[PDB]
Amino acid sequence: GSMVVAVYPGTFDPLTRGHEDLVRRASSIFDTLVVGVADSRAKKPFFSLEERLKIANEVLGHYPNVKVMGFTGLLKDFVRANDARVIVRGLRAVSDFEYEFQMAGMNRYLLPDVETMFMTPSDQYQFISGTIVREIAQLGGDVSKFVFPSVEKWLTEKVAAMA
Amino acid sequence: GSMVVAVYPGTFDPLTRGHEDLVRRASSIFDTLVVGVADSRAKKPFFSLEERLKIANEVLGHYPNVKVMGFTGLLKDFVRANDARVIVRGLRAVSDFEYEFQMAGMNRYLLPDVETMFMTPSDQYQFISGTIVREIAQLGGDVSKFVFPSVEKWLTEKVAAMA
Amino acid sequence: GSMVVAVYPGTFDPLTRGHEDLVRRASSIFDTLVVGVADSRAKKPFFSLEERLKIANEVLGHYPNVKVMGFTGLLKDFVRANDARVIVRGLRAVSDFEYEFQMAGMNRYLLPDVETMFMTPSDQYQFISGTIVREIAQLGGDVSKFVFPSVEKWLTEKVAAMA
Amino acid sequence: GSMVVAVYPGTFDPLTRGHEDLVRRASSIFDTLVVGVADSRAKKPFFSLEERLKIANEVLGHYPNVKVMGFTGLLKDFVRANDARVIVRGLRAVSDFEYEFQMAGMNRYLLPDVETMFMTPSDQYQFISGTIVREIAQLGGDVSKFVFPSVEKWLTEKVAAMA
Amino acid sequence: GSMVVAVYPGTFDPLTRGHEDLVRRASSIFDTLVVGVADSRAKKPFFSLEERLKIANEVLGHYPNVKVMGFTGLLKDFVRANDARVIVRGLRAVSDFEYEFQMAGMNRYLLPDVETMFMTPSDQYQFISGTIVREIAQLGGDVSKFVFPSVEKWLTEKVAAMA
Amino acid sequence: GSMVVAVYPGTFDPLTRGHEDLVRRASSIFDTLVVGVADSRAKKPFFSLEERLKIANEVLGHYPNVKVMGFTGLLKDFVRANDARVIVRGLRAVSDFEYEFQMAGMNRYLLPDVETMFMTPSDQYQFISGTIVREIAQLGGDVSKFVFPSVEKWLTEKVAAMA
Ligand SMILES: CC(C)(COP(=O)(O)OP(=O)(O)O)[C@@H](O)C(=O)NCCC(=O)NCCS
Ligand SMILES: CC(C)(COP(=O)(O)OP(=O)(O)O)[C@@H](O)C(=O)NCCC(=O)NCCS
Ligand SMILES: CC(C)(COP(=O)(O)OP(=O)(O)O)[C@@H](O)C(=O)NCCC(=O)NCCS
Ligand SMILES: CC(C)(COP(=O)(O)OP(=O)(O)O)[C@@H](O)C(=O)NCCC(=O)NCCS
Ligand SMILES: CC(C)(COP(=O)(O)OP(=O)(O)O)[C@@H](O)C(=O)NCCC(=O)NCCS
Ligand SMILES: CC(C)(COP(=O)(O)OP(=O)(O)O)[C@@H](O)C(=O)NCCC(=O)NCCS
Ligand SMILES: Nc1ncnc2[nH]cnc12
Ligand SMILES: Nc1ncnc2[nH]cnc12
Ligand SMILES: Nc1ncnc2[nH]cnc12
Ligand SMILES: Nc1ncnc2[nH]cnc12
Ligand SMILES: Nc1ncnc2[nH]cnc12
Ligand SMILES: Nc1ncnc2[nH]cnc12
Numbered sequence: 001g002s003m004v005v006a007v008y009p010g011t012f013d014p015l016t017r018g019h020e021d022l023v024r025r026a027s028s029i030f031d032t033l034v035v036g037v038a039d040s041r042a043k044k045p046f047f048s049l050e051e052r053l054k055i056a057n058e059v060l061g062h063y064p065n066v067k068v069m070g071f072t073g074l075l076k077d078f079v080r081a082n083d084a085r086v087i088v089r090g091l092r093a094v095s096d097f098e099y100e101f102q103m104a105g106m107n108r109y110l111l112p113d114v115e116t117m118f119m120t121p122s123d124q125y126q127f128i129s130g131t132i133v134r135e136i137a138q139l140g141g142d143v144s145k146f147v148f149p150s151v152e153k154w155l156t157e158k159v160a161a162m163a
Numbered sequence: 164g165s166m167v168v169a170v171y172p173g174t175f176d177p178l179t180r181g182h183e184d185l186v187r188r189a190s191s192i193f194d195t196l197v198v199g200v201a202d203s204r205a206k207k208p209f210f211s212l213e214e215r216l217k218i219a220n221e222v223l224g225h226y227p228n229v230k231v232m233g234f235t236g237l238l239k240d241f242v243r244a245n246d247a248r249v250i251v252r253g254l255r256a257v258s259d260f261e262y263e264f265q266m267a268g269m270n271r272y273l274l275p276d277v278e279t280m281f282m283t284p285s286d287q288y289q290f291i292s293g294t295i296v297r298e299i300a301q302l303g304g305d306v307s308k309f310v311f312p313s314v315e316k317w318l319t320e321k322v323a324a325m326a
Numbered sequence: 327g328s329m330v331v332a333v334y335p336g337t338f339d340p341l342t343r344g345h346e347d348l349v350r351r352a353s354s355i356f357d358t359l360v361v362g363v364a365d366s367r368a369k370k371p372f373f374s375l376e377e378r379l380k381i382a383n384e385v386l387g388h389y390p391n392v393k394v395m396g397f398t399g400l401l402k403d404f405v406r407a408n409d410a411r412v413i414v415r416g417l418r419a420v421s422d423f424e425y426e427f428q429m430a431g432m433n434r435y436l437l438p439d440v441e442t443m444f445m446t447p448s449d450q451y452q453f454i455s456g457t458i459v460r461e462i463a464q465l466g467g468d469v470s471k472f473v474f475p476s477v478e479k480w481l482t483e484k485v486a487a488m489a
Numbered sequence: 490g491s492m493v494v495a496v497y498p499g500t501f502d503p504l505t506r507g508h509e510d511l512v513r514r515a516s517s518i519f520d521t522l523v524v525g526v527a528d529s530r531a532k533k534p535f536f537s538l539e540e541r542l543k544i545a546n547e548v549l550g551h552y553p554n555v556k557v558m559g560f561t562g563l564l565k566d567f568v569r570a571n572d573a574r575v576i577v578r579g580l581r582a583v584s585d586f587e588y589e590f591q592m593a594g595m596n597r598y599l600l601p602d603v604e605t606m607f608m609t610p611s612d613q614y615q616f617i618s619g620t621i622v623r624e625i626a627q628l629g630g631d632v633s634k635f636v637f638p639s640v641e642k643w644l645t646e647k648v649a650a651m652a
Numbered sequence: 653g654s655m656v657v658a659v660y661p662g663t664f665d666p667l668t669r670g671h672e673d674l675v676r677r678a679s680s681i682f683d684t685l686v687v688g689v690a691d692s693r694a695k696k697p698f699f700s701l702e703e704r705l706k707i708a709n710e711v712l713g714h715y716p717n718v719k720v721m722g723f724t725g726l727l728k729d730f731v732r733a734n735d736a737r738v739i740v741r742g743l744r745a746v747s748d749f750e751y752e753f754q755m756a757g758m759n760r761y762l763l764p765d766v767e768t769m770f771m772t773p774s775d776q777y778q779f780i781s782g783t784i785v786r787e788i789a790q791l792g793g794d795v796s797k798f799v800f801p802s803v804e805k806w807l808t809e810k811v812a813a814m815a
Numbered sequence: 816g817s818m819v820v821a822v823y824p825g826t827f828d829p830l831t832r833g834h835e836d837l838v839r840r841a842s843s844i845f846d847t848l849v850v851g852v853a854d855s856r857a858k859k860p861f862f863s864l865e866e867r868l869k870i871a872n873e874v875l876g877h878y879p880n881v882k883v884m885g886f887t888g889l890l891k892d893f894v895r896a897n898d899a900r901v902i903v904r905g906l907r908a909v910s911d912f913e914y915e916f917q918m919a920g921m922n923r924y925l926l927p928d929v930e931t932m933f934m935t936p937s938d939q940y941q942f943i944s945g946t947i948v949r950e951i952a953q954l955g956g957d958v959s960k961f962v963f964p965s966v967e968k969w970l971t972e973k974v975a976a977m978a
Contacts, residue, residue: 001166001194025278029249031164042950074956086192091254091281093264093582093615094750094757098909101256104283105909105942106951109960115188118254118281120267123612126582127757135694136758141726145761205624237630256908256941257424257431261583268583268616269625272634286938289908290431298368299432304400308435327818327846351930355901357816412844417906417933419745419778419916420587420594427908430935441840444906444933446919449775452745453594461531462595467563471598490655490683514767518738520653575681580743580770582753590745593772604677607743607770609756746913746920779920787857788921793889797924 006086006117007079009036013045014151015056016133018125022090025119027066034082035060039072046134047158058150076110084114091118092126169249169280170242172199176208177314178219179296181288185253188282190229197245198223202235209297210321221313239273247277254281255289332412332443333405335362339371340477341382342459344451348416351445353392360408361386365398372460373484384476402436410440417444418452495575495606496568498525502534503640504545505622507614511579514608516555523571524549528561535623536647547639565599573603580607581615658738658769659731661688665697666803667708668785670777674742677771679718686734687712691724698786699810710802728762736766743770744778821901821932822894824851828860829966830871831948833940837905840934842881849897850875854887861949862973873965891925899929906933907941 008026012019012035027033035056039049047055049070056068071078079087087107089100104116120126128146137143137155144152171189175182175198190196198219202212210218212233219231234241242250250270252263267279283289291309300306300318307315334352338345338361353359361382365375373381375396382394397404405413413433415426430442446452454472463469463481470478497515501508501524516522524545528538536544538559545557560567568576576596578589593605609615617635626632626644633641660678664671664687679685687708691701699707701722708720723730731739739759741752756768772778780798789795789807796804823841827834827850842848850871854864862870864885871883886893894902902922904915919931935941943961952958952970959967 001164003164004167004192028276029167029278029280042953074951074954076956093260094753096750097256097260098911099944101283101909102942102944102947105286106944106947106961108283108286108942110956113191115192115282117192119278120264120271123268123271123615126612126615127754127760129751129754129758132754132758136726138694139726141728141762146758205627237625237628239630257427259424261585262618264583265616265618265621269618269621269635271616273630286941289938289941290428290434292425292428292432295428295432299400301368302400304402304436309432327816329816330819330844354928355819355930355932419912420590422587423908423912427935431938434935434938439843441844441934443844445930446916446923449778449920449923452775452778453591453597455588455591455595458591458595462563464531465563467565467599472595490653492653493656493681517765518656518767518769582749586745586749590772594775597772597775602680604681604771606681608767609753609760612757612760746916748913779917779923781914781917781921784917784921788889790857791889793891793925798921 003031004086005032005034005082005084006030006088007034007036007082007084008088009038009075009078011040011043011045012037012052012056013040013047013130013134014052014147014154015059016125016128016130016147018090018121018128020059020148021121021125022088022119023060023063023066025121026088027063030086031065033066033088034084035066035068036075036078037068037070038075039070047154051154055151055154059148075107079111079114087114087116089116089118090121092120094127166194167249168195168197168245168247169193169251170197170199170245170247171251172201172238172241174203174206174208175200175215175219176203176210176293176297177215177310177317178222179288179291179293179310181253181284181291183222183311184284184288185251185282186223186226186229188284189251190226193249194228196229196251197247198229198231199238199241200231200233201238202233210317214317218314218317222311238270242274242277250277250279252279252281253284255283257290329357330412331358331360331408331410332356332414333360333362333408333410334414335364335401335404337366337369337371338363338378338382339366339373339456339460340378340473340480341385342451342454342456342473344416344447344454346385346474347447347451348414348445349386349389349392351447352414353389356412357391359392359414360410361392361394362401362404363394363396364401365396373480377480381477381480385474401433405437405440413440413442415442415444416447418446420453492520493575494521494523494571494573495519495577496523496525496571496573497577498527498564498567500529500532500534501526501541501545502529502536502619502623503541503636503643504548505614505617505619505636507579507610507617509548509637510610510614511577511608512549512552512555514610515577516552519575520554522555522577523573524555524557525564525567526557526559527564528559536643540643544640544643548637564596568600568603576603576605578605578607579610581609583616655683656738657684657686657734657736658682658740659686659688659734659736660740661690661727661730663692663695663697664689664704664708665692665699665782665786666704666799666806667711668777668780668782668799670742670773670780672711672800673773673777674740674771675712675715675718677773678740679715682738683717685718685740686736687718687720688727688730689720689722690727691722699806703806707803707806711800727759731763731766739766739768741768741770742773744772746779818846819901820847820849820897820899821845821903822849822851822897822899823903824853824890824893826855826858826860827852827867827871828855828862828945828949829867829962829969830874831940831943831945831962833905833936833943835874835963836936836940837903837934838875838878838881840936841903842878845901846880848881848903849899850881850883851890851893852883852885853890854885862969866969870966870969874963890922894926894929902929902931904931904933905936907935909942
């Protein structure tokens, strides 16, 4: 047929069960799925880029056609670097639709030949917010329903270290 | 790489410039794109299924990896019949999001291993409504900005015949 | 300054307190406000066009710079006929946004030099649905909170006549 | 404490797993939950009112504090008749929000002392559309993931009878 | 009947007329309404928790079945502590729906037997934003249409003190 | 006819092609269009007010009936100062609708006789986000598709100076 590489970009602070489900689904469609972890300095992420990469690799490493890579520059440049024809984003019934469609429209100007394609996670992950996950973890609450056990370990350790 | 077939289903009453742009974009990603024209009896389409197939074939025939086919039954069965792993739908900033996400969620129960993926047409087609196109044509207004010339011809002829 | 005519188009089946408030507000801004009552045959209106014009004239006649006129063709043609530079539409927090933005976008193709401008009625009218008004009236319920007394009279008489 | 009766009104054409989950949840909060099945003549329901009542009673009869009753008039009057202080509606991420908030706002005028309260079904039922359920059943597709077995039986029998 | 306690949680920075209306409505339905004022450290509230509690007590103290209490931990724990079966939230036509449904869905995992129920304030309070209230007060503008006189006094004093 | 002044207020950090299109459209309708650049201290703008005024004047100066003015206080006061009867805002399919309708509703309390009117930019500018423009510029990416060349120059110089 053809070889199609897709990029699934995000801050992934941290990778949730929603993100993992999207990776499972997208990697079943595309020949290679590149999970692009953006530095996202201005968003003031809880975990460092190095930490977010380790967290994501722990969860996703077993998928044979998934690559986890960080990037500090423009998504445009990361997509081109990976010879990607598709940007995959998760879209849920409770997504920030304004944000998603603005990004897709602007990336459409920056990368006219690259398609943004939206996929949907399983029903049970449709309502997970990363911001709320971090809030719960910081207040000492368990987030096991929302993130994998390995990710819980990172949250617990980071919360304890910052105190 | 792999051979991935996608289905782009719709009533296509008639095929608009928005639909055509989605076909152009989707057929650039997938090895084969099957445009599935649903009979949609209960929706009381303006054009018959035979007519909608002719209209769509006139516009889309030149695309070498696009197949236009009608179906009178369940989308589930049409997808399986075409060995398709993806259902492509257009999503625009003004889409019926309730409708799209309900269909995707229910098809998720009917076809757990098939992914609904949403794509976006060019900015200039984001606001075209087929219902409004038919309304304009029936009142004798030109719809050339919204549909291809071949489709305009069908609308004009059908409007004249029904009077 | 300048002379600016705006058109406020609708089916007005019947004119509600929400519509009247929009007319009051729009007529305070524009030199002339033309209330365009569309025949809307395909929508199967409860009141005939002649009736909808009488209903609207009863409520709006006192406004010195408001003209109520029917039309059976394209809005494009009605706007041009009235030398209008603006199409006014009501936008409420519970509007059919898909519908409104599709119409505005398509009218933008049909009438590039005419601006669709959205105005908001008072809080107390933001949730009035004409469809629900007709439903209540047909089941013999009072709609005085939603329409003016003159309009109530028309609803009562039409409901009684159809039985 | 207090005795609070709530009404859960709908067309219920037919009762789905989403509706049943809402009944389970609402009946756990309120002393009595009255499921009000509206005749909804103008909506042209697939099942008659008598049929919709039988369908709902089959599914809901086992709940000791749930009453299933039909009504042919105004919801206002049905609520007052049942001494209800609350109207419960399901709200899902894919609800017709325009419709729900218009109804709540208008019922607020009709019944100022009655509160419309929105509840959410389980994630797995958030995307079920009754319209799509009927469409699938009419095309001979199984809807067991969306409705209870007793309801499937009614759909099958009605579809067979209408052919 | 039964004794049902509901919690109405929020940052309440400060309590607005919208919040007060929701308390009035909710306390008419539930046997006890607990207004839970979250510390919300990360949100960087304008008023301290102690101040927000005083502000809310001044407005709400007269309601005989309303309790105002602060909390520094998880909502889950506060709900359980108060033996509450319901979390009440205000939902307006201009609510952050993404945020509300994410919280409800995640609390559904944390507290499966507790129902999030959404209520609607009066039309006249549907468009009040606390963020905009604080912005106006900080720029020396009157917010009496949006908050009670006692709350205005707190805003004025805090604005003057911070300068 | 009449002399109608409208205010188009914003932070304009910086003025984008979307804003410019709205100014072009609004200034064709109103006798005078005042572009009000709010200090917006709390939003922590990238450009100072003086800079944002220079940026906007460079782009908009050629429009004979457009005035660009800064303000540090309440919009209410700026509107009254300019004898304005209309506040114009851009509304796009991807707007923050919550934010826009809250502002309009609250300004409706502050300025009952002033109408907020929403206008729509051309399709090609509907998806431009100022936040994303700043993000791209800070990462050294070209934003020429989103802002005028003069504005690009300001972004480049400010980015270089802050490093
Ligand atoms: C990181 C990304 C993809 C946004 O992702 P996000 O919404 O934080 O992902 P999340 O982890 O929430 O799923 C976006 O900000 C991005 O692409 N950043 C890189 C810089 C860039 O190219 N910006 C222009 C985007 S149009
Ligand atoms: C036809 C289709 C795809 C809806 O398409 P549509 O929204 O009319 O497409 P449009 O032409 O408007 O782009 C849908 O109704 C469908 O799949 N119909 C076939 C019967 C079926 O399987 N229904 C269950 C859908 S979950
Ligand atoms: C009638 C109108 C304005 C829609 O109004 P509406 O939403 O029914 O108005 P309502 O009475 O609900 O406020 C629209 O259907 C129209 O313009 N009809 C005339 C024919 C036409 O030109 N159609 C193309 C619209 S892009
Ligand atoms: C039937 C009802 C509740 C709408 O329900 P629905 O959305 O069809 O319910 P569904 O079965 O889809 O869950 C509504 O149309 C109604 O109340 N009808 C009775 C007549 C009436 O009072 N109408 C005024 C409603 S404000
Ligand atoms: C405070 C609350 C309820 C959000 O309220 P809010 O939207 O700030 O309320 P407002 O005052 O705007 O009406 C929420 O952040 C919360 O529950 N915080 C406590 C910590 C917690 O349990 N977080 C998990 C929420 S799923
Ligand atoms: C600046 C403004 C108009 C918001 O604009 P904005 O959304 O930042 O505009 P943008 O540049 O994004 O187009 C608003 O915050 C404002 O009016 N600020 C002045 C102070 C004020 O009066 N606030 C009350 C607003 S109801
Ligand atoms: N729960 C979730 N599922 C998929 N994509 C997401 N992006 C953010 N949250 C998500
Ligand atoms: N204009 C449009 N573009 C893409 N898909 C669509 N589906 C319906 N209208 C569409
Ligand atoms: N209540 C209302 N107010 C203004 N415009 C409307 N259009 C339809 N309903 C309306
Ligand atoms: N799936 C569903 N769940 C709850 N309420 C509903 N109303 C309509 N569909 C529903
Ligand atoms: N105005 C308002 N009314 C009710 N709940 C709210 N939550 C935030 N603002 C609100
Ligand atoms: N692209 C855009 N067009 C018009 N108004 C806007 N406000 C913010 N972004 C805008």
